[PDB]
Symmetry: D2
Subunit: 284 residues, 4 copies
Amino acid sequence: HNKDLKGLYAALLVPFDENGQVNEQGLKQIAQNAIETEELDGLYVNGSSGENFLLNTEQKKQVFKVAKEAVGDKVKLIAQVGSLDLNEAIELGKYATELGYDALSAVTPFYYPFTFEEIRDYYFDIIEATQNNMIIYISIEQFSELFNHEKIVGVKYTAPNFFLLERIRKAFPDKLILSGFDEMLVQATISGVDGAIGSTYNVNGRRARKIFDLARQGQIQEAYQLQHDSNDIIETVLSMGIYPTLKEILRHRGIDAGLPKRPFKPFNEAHRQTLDQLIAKYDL
Amino acid sequence: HHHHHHNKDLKGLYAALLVPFDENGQVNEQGLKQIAQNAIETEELDGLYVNGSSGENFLLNTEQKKQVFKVAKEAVGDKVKLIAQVGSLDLNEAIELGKYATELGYDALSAVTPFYYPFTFEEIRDYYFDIIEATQNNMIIYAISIEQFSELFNHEKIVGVKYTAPNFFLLERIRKAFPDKLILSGFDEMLVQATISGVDGAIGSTYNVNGRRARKIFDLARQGQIQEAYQLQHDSNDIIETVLSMGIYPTLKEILRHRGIDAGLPKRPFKPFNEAHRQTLDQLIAKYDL
Amino acid sequence: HHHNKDLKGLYAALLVPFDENGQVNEQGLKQIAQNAIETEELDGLYVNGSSGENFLLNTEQKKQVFKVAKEAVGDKVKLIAQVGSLDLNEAIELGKYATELGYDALSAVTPFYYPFTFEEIRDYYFDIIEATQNNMIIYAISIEQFSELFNHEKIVGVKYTAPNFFLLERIRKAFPDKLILSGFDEMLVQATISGVDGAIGSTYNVNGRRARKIFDLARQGQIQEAYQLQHDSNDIIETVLSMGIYPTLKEILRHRGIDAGLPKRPFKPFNEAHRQTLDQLIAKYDL
Amino acid sequence: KDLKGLYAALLVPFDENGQVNEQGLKQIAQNAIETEELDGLYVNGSSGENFLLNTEQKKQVFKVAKEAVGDKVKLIAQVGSLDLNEAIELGKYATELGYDALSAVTPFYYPFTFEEIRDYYFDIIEATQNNMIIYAISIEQFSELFNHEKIVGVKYTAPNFFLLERIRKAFPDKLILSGFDEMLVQATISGVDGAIGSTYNVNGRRARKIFDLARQGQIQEAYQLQHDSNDIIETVLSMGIYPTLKEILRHRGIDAGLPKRPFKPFNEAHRQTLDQLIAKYDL
Ligand SMILES: [Cl-]
Ligand SMILES: [Cl-]
Ligand SMILES: [Cl-]
Ligand SMILES: [Cl-]
């Protein structure tokens, strides 16, 4: 039977060597850190946070495989397979489905000015070919046309608009809404999201769980205080270059967090003192 | 000199006061009093926010704005909080309106960010400082970065902010950086998210017709009945969505006509409520008992 | 030829000098208006647009500026009165006034601040026209919408200010007999070859001579020389933008012995920290 | 070669599985040069549906286009990609085929810093040793990029004529090729050394006259051809530019195939309007 997809997920980070090749041992450690240290429900694999759009197809497969290998059978797995290359997307979708990922997701085709019908049929084509459940990333009338499909089970919701989130939550009580803005987890929780996916949950998963639980449980003031504490972290990490900095924090716990893939630059050492201070203040 | 002025706290829910006009764009004073009183008595709101965007303030001449301030003041009792929006691209006008509202006893002034031209931050800062300087009243600014907010809030008479930016990350940063300043959110459709974000209150045009629900959202959310708070936000957003699609100011005033209020017309160039919307409006009023 | 083209030419968007209390300095205003015509050699004045700090003024001040500008120039000089306002009663009042004064046309900024519908924008123009019976220049809305506005016999043209040369070309093709005056001084040469009938600019108060050469040279196919003057004009425009356009333009005018006064607050005065850079600009281009 | 002149942003025909049609592609390449009379081909740009391709299809496009045209034809290889290893692999491959210059889109999607954008360009240059054409960014930053002797110019696509004028006089010895077909005459009088465009695949003769006549001071006749060209560009845009431009080529007996999904094919509800355009302008 299919797992329940509600929960909190680490948007999985990927460690690279000097030549932009995946470091499999570090990747394994990052996946395990998300589940075993940060106590999260699931991995969201090959999203933006994993520098996925910097990868070739064979690299994306290697990440899908290492992540699955790293976690137990009860860990929820969502495979972001979106690409401007629909043939690649279908091939990654099939491969991830065959590995047993619980659901696929796919970024809105981007760069070019695709029409809505082009966007809709890119999702439907991926579904036809893979037969896996799908999570999308649009007017309400358009969401409806997408959500009308039984295999589009939900949306990874990342646009910062709470009026549109509310309208969608209302219109589609039967669909999974997983929010993607860590810095607004508490507002997303009270807006009825079914969970969230975040890159900072790799280092701040415990506080994230409390915000989500406390807010649902009606303890708003304490959830909001933890949102304050979390946003210090998020703001700091953002100002230092978010991917390298998150991986520098993980490096600090003994994980082989490697480098970002160029053209991303590595963590700038002039930020080291400010980062050490953050780690100490929030015991990261 | 010797009079004991009631120094009101400015927390709570405020109607952004709507204004009824005749065919020549003149203020219908008697409809205004009705609208002001609906807000306080029927809608059970804490205060009136006067001569904001909602009151078609930027369509008015200086005399009409003074007129609006006087009539809203007349129409309510001494327990009602009053904030006077006095912002204008004409700073002399803003100072004039600021003095006149303060003399009437308005509890605070507010002023929109100077607009149209690309003013620098130094110019926006000094607009606010010049109005405060000439009126000596407390001032609520509009939303500018956190560092600039810090310079602004370092003025003792800038007591708070009418926050309309749809950004809950910046709202949270502001709430944390300035725990002792007043924050009133201006997005009716996100009142529940503002509340759990620690706003002190809210100003809205739809509170003229949905203030009872608005209060329930505000209270239930703070009491941690968040599920019930949100369900009332769903309902409210049904309303707000509908009225936005028909033209917010005329439609809101058409909802007040139905209560027997003399809601008149919007000022041109605003067009009247289009009768082609009449049947959907009637249906919305019916389902939500407005 | 069409009578819609009567108002072709090059216009100073008239600057206004104020005292410390935001009051109009009438004599310096006269000097600015005369400088535009006599020194800069322009065809006309565009009076009470944004450049004149119009939206900072009360109704009486806008009338004052309309009156003095008109008094300062001869009957040969072309006059356009920007009367647009969020207050349509004010707009109509200013319109009648400017018309009775003998202004050749009215113009009006697109209703702003609120999200007005197109139908609301259109009837704002239509109400001004009906109440004033003057010719009207609109501001830049799709071509289908332009087609609707330009069907009014009293809407003679557009003061075109969108940075978009595809839309302009489309407009110029679709309305060969309407007036098009461009409002971007830094793209005058591009507007010219795109068939504009003229231009309205704040920088022509200090650089109207180069501007006329750009316009004439480019219409004459002397594109290289015309472009070289745009390079010149763009050093000037870019420099002045970096220092605060209205106070800086007025400072250049003070350098010529004109009583240029101050910007109206909340605009701040020329910041002395730009003094050396400005002087360097004035000497380089002989301004 | 001197890089001045007019280039077709090369279109690519696909079959229903999104595989390159090599014969139609050779035909498209040759139409640009022989029929449209252009100086060169801009290869694997956005117009070629490049960003929908895998690495092997991109190589395939570079090879076919180069083998399709004479030695005297100017060739620029767009190799930009979010995958820098891929960009560098493509840059080496296109360089070894003999492309006269590389170009690379600005790294996109993620909020890259300027330092990241800069060194992406410099890393590609370092590894390929070919000349590079950047995409467009402040003047102080252009200066940092153009300080590099191998960064020989910019494909300028943002229709801001203030910034373009600023760049032209700041960098009078660098190459500037504009990317907006609908504003070619404004670009020409602003001193561009040439242009790259998708619509030049069907309308390259008018475009040459616009370029030439405008520089000859025959400004009104240049502008008239721009009116005519903008009727075409407008129409083509309203129907879906790439499938429509390819449909125009198909009218000429070329095997113009299909767009790669998720682009959809030409919608036949547009056929009559397209027929009338082709008749009106002899396309
Ligand atoms: Cl992600
Ligand atoms: Cl308001
Ligand atoms: Cl102006
Ligand atoms: Cl291209």
